[PDB]
Amino acid sequence: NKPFDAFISYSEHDADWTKEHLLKKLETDGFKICYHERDFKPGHPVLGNIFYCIENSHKVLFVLSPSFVNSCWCQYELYFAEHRVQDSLIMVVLEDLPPDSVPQKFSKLRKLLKRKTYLKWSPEEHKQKIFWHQLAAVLKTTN
Amino acid sequence: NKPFDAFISYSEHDADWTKEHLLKKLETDGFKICYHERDFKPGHPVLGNIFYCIENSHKVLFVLSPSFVNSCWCQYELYFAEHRVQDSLIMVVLEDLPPDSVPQKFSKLRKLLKRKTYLKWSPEEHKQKIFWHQLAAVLKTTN
């Protein structure tokens, strides 16, 4: 029984979409989210380290796009979650990733993408409505 | 026989000092340095991932200060090096770290600081001259 439903990570390039769509919808619908842009407090002994969100969240959710995979900072975030975290991972593909673009040593993300375990965003309202129900569903699954 | 003598990591707050003093001196004196601000190439299959510098550098050098320890991004960099890398680590204390400020789960940095294995910067020219000779010395040690 973690206090947060998900720790969410996303690239700077995807920040506007994530805040305006993903975060807003999830929080309006009652999910409790931990994310560093809001919840990391530099110098705070509890809130100012990177273990806080992931240790207190049921799921880890990554927003995936080329900008995420090619970002130095996002690769560090991927490394951390891969080595800290399993069924607790949730991948949202916002934009298609070119084949073999994920660095070879990110075995977990590679196998998860290869095995089609992600949810994919769509521009069409009908597919988006399904997306949001399926995202809520996967956030509530066991680990 | 690695192509780079060191992969160097430093906080945004310390970027001016690191480029103007550490990087300039080391490169003027013949050391070959890998650091992401210059050498990470987004999207490049070889140069656009975080494993390139560390895998091709003899040493890993961190510039330490409160701004480093309290930075979300620097904590991710610390996690990566701690789990990837041992004698290959080199800590340069640019500014004193308050006691117990390093998050508890960074065991390696904590034990290394506790055991006084770092080099400390000084404002005094005489101590700086010694610092630079000692930094060159430690960069050339075996791993």
Author numbering:
A (entry chain A), B (entry chain A): 704 to 788, 793 to 850
What's in the article?
TLR15 is a TLR unique to birds and reptiles that responds to virulence-associated fungal and bacterial proteases. The ectodomain of a TLR directly senses a PAMP and the intracellular TIR domain dimerizes to initiate a signaling cascade. Collectively, our structural and mutational analyses suggest that TLR15TIR employs the BB, αC2 and DD regions for dimerization.
